[PDB]
Amino acid sequence: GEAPNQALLRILKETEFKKIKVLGSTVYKGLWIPEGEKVKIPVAIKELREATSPKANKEILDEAYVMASVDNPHVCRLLGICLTSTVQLIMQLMPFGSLLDYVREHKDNIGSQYLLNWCVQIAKGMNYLEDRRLVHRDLAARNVLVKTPQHVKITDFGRAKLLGAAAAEYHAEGGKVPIKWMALESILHRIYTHQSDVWSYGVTVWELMTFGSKPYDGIPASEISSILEKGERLPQPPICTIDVYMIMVKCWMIDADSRPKFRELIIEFSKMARDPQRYLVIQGDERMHLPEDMDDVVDADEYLIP
Ligand SMILES: */C=C/C(=O)Nc1cc(-c2ccccc2)ccn1
């Protein structure tokens, strides 16, 4: 046996929400007004392109299946879908964009407290995904979103695989892949587990401590297998103490069960977030600070449906 997934999929009318402007090329920034609820919820609307490509609709509703089946503060909520000519995913708007573009744009403004809180919240998000027997398979800084600089959510469940009642690792077959974030076992034999997610968590933390540097930048993805089998890893980022970087190294052990458990990463970064300056050394660290009637505006996170 396995647990029934009793998640609600909400179908929304096109009339319940107003497309304000474009965010990506087709993701819109908009507002959702639940019929006779007197609440305005900032939303990001993912609308299909051609939306006649059957295989593309499979993907998007598979994203929807996974996103509806998650309810955690460090993982982004699917608010519902609109079944129009072109399927629309309606999600909580994460106004400040991908954490990757965030650390790139604000490296001069990002203190140790924020980096180390980001490491914890992402690890809470991921440890929630392990609790729900779910393997992300595409965790990177690009796929973490910034509701505020104090609060990030894991995203892109387009590659997430909902493990079996005894499916030890998720077998897969071909496509475009995240080589430079991937556990060695995934590159070589397409093995993906909560542990191979932890590996990508390590590349995710590396990206954050380097303020968004490209992992193995200028190294073809063809060699990455041989480089990792040869024992090579990503280098210690400047701002990183041996401590922090040693947690990243542990995430990249070849023995999967020798890597840290997400619940462990929470504890370890939590400890370090209690004394951030002792664990991350950044020029001017203490100096650092970060941020049409909207009367009935309410964040997705304060909008609860039973
Ligand atoms: C998990 C919620 C979510 O995706 N919110 C969101 C997403 C974007 C976005 C989507 C696709 C590409 C770029 C940016 C922007 C704001 N919130």
CATH code: domain of residue 27:
3.30.200.20
First to last CA, the chain: 26
**Could you give the CA distance from residue 92 to residue 55 in angstroms, rounded to a whole number?**
25
Domain boundary among 38, 64, 93: 93
Pair 91, 67: CB distance under 8 Å: yes
**Could you give the CA distance from residue 281 to residue 209 in angstroms, rounded to a whole number?**
10
Same domain, 131 and 238: yes
Q: How far is the CA of 45 from the centre of ligand 1 (A)?
A: 8
The number of domains in the chain is: 2
**Could you give the CA distance from residue 194 to residue 126 in angstroms, rounded to a whole number?**
8
Ligand 1 within 6 A of 155 CB? yes
Pair 79, 32: CB distance under 8 Å: yes
Q: How far is the CA of 59 from the centre of ligand 1 (A)?
A: 16
Write the CB contacts of 230 (distance below 8 Å, at least 6 apart in sequence).
Answer: none
Torsion angle defined by CA atoms of residues 85, 90, 94 and 97, in that order, rounded to the nearest 10 degrees = -20
Q: Give, using CA atoms, the residue closest to atom 10 of ligand 1.
A: 27
Ligand 1 within 6 A of 187 CB? no
Same domain, 37 and 165: no
Ligand 1 within 6 A of 143 CB? no
Same domain, 85 and 126: no
- Give the determination technique: X-ray
Ligand 1 within 6 A of 22 CB? no
Does residue 5 sit within a domain?
no
Buried b (16+ CB within 10 A) or exposed e, 219-244: eeeeebeeebeeeebbebbebbbeeb
Same domain, 152 and 226: yes
- What 104-110 contacts at long range (C-beta under 8 Å, 24+ apart), as own/partner pairs, is 104/211, 104/212, 106/290, 107/211, 107/212, 109/288, 109/289, 109/290, 110/211, 110/282, 110/288, 110/290
Residue 136 C-alpha from the chain's centroid: 8
Q: Which domain holds residue 156?
A: 99-278
Which two structure tokens, joined as six digits, stand for 10? 């909400």
Write the CB contacts of 206 (distance below 8 Å, at least 6 apart in sequence).
Answer: 213, 215, 234, 237, 248
